[PDB]
Design a protein around this ligand. Structure first.
Ligand SMILES: O=C(O)CCc1cccc(-c2ncnc3c2ncn3[C@@H]2O[C@H](COP(=O)(O)O)[C@@H](O)[C@H]2O)c1
Length: 134
């Protein structure tokens, strides 16, 4: 079930959670915790995303994903932080899967604000399934 040989060197964060709820330090904390667990599991995600920006609303998804595709050669993944149930999820999947062919992984804001080994493990397993056997 689990894939070896994944190395995620070029990846982006698109934060659809409001900055006042999911701060720069929450993003840095979450990213560092994800770096360490993904590494321990032999699917290392490098500590520094090439891009980390806030956006709001489903209409921002296509412009930002077009920008990412146009700017970052060898981009392997966009981690999308969502604030609860939101039409932004459907739009991220429409643009990523059907328009631009860009791998995306969505995560709940509450799991970025406060991490646990179990929820970082849940996320690594979803990423592994996506980026494994390409
Ligand atoms: O339009 C509306 O009013 C709400 C629409 C709606 C209906 C059903 C589900 C959603 C939805 N909203 C936000 N996050 C969602 C979601 N469905 C799944 N997710 C998130 O995406 C993650 C899965 O990400 P990937 O599909 O990239 O593996 C789930 O863990 C969960 O964290 C949104």
């Amino acid at each position: 079930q689990f894939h070896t040989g994944i190395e995620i060197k070029v990846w982006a964060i698109a934060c659809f959670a409001p900055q006042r709820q999911c701060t720069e330090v929450h993003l840095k904390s979450f990213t560092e915790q994800l770096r360490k667990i993904s590494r321990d599991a032999g699917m290392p995600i490098q500590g520094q995303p090439c891009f980390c920006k806030y956006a709001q609303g489903a209409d921002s998804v296509e412009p930002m994903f077009r920008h990412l595709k146009n700017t970052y050669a060898g981009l392997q993944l966009v981690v999308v932080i969502l604030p609860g149930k939101t039409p932004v999820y459907a739009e991220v999947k429409r643009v990523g899967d059907t328009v631009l062919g860009m791998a995306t992984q969505c995560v709940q804001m509450k799991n970025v604000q406060r991490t646990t080994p179990q929820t970082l493990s849940n996320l690594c397993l979803k990423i592994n399934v996506k980026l494994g056997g390409v």
